[PDB]
Amino acid sequence: ITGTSTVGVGRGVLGDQKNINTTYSTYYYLQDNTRGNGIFTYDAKYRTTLPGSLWADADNQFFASYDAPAVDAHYYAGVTYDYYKNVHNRLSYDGNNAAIRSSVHYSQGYNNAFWNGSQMVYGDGDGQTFIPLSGGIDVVAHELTHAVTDYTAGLIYQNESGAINEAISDIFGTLVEFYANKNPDWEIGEDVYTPGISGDSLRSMSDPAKYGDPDHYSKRYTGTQDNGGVHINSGIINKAAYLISQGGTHYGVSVVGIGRDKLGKIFYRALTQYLTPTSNFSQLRAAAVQSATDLYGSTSQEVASVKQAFDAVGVK
Ligand SMILES: [Ca+2]
Ligand SMILES: [Ca+2]
Ligand SMILES: [Ca+2]
Ligand SMILES: [Ca+2]
Ligand SMILES: [Zn+2]
């Protein structure tokens, strides 16, 4: 809508207060005009029809419990936009400042979130497996990163290509969590998963096998479930990424860590420059080595650590 940019205040899913960019025209709308062509947040009103209604509020104060998921979807999308701009010089998900749209209150008891090819969508959870999903910054950044991947490498959501697609979203979701920092960790979804149980998460990058996910190529899932294991086999790549950043010894192979900032640079370059829609794990390794080479030289410690990491998870 057309109007005057302003700033409102509200409370997110976890009860934390924050300022959000809104737009005023009779009502106050969740429309942030300060970032690219805008960040827009919609109410799906417990239906599955999308996008729903651009979120309108009478007084620019967002403290109702119904408001919480919208506040966080809207705010964390802004933080994710800032991460890509300030760190990777990328303007929105398409590189030309596309508007970012999210809908919350999707369906009833919906225990997931997703990028649907055009926008992000967030369920409220059923209140025991998940609380509203936009309350996790790693979840928001994971979904938005699917948009980035779709406009760059275009990794097919199937088999090894799909597992790389998912891993990339976990890696950047985590890097964005550390950017905002934020109680950052190497777990996925801990803030919104099982409000009844502390210390757990949906997936672990530091120890995928903690939740039954493979951490070595020999343990990859080869069946047909989950589009050929896209959320399962991502564990192999997440572990490699964790090792490149933080270092460690995994199955007898030692990796010297090079830290998060270089991990992000190497993987962003691999994604935007070298990966294609049908890339497999072995092609990922080649892309990552070539990226590190491009950036730090063929005899760098950085290239050596990338090679070490993939050797350790059994990817040749
Ligand atoms: Ca209000
Ligand atoms: Ca965390
Ligand atoms: Ca996390
Ligand atoms: Ca939990
Ligand atoms: Zn995903």
UniProtKB/Swiss-Prot annotation:
Q: Catalysed reaction(s)? A: Preferential cleavage: Xaa-|-Leu > Xaa-|-Phe
> Where does it localize?
Secreted
Which parts of the sequence bind Ca(2+) 1?
D57, D59, Q61
Q: How does activity depend on temperature?
A: Thermostable.
Give binding positions for Zn(2+).
Answer: H142, H146, E166
Q: Which cofactor does it need?
A: Ca(2+); Zn(2+)
> Which GO BP annotation is one of this protein's?
proteolysis
User: Which keywords belong to this entry?
Assistant: Calcium, Hydrolase, Metal-binding, Metalloprotease, Protease, Secreted, Signal, Zinc, Zymogen
UniProt superkingdom: Bacteria
| Cofactor: binding comment | Binds 4 Ca(2+) ions per subunit. Binds 1 zinc ion per subunit.
Q: Which GO terms describe its molecular function?
A: metal ion binding; metalloendopeptidase activity
Which residues hold Ca(2+) 2? D138, E177, D185, E187, E190
Catalytic residue list? E143, H231 (proton donor)
Q: Where does Ca(2+) 3 bind?
A: E177, N183, D185, E190
Enzyme Commission number(s): 3.4.24.27
Q: Where does Ca(2+) 4 bind?
A: Y193, T194, I197, D200
The reply to whether DNA-binding figures as a keyword in the UniProt entry is: no
**Gene Ontology annotations for the cellular component aspect, listed alphabetically:** extracellular region
Predominant localisation class: secreted
User: What family does this chain come from, according to its entry?
Assistant: Belongs to the peptidase M4 family.
What is the role of the protein in this entry?
Extracellular zinc metalloprotease.
- Specify the protein name: Thermolysin
Gene source species: Bacillus thermoproteolyticus
Entire-sequence positions represented here: 233 to 548 of 548
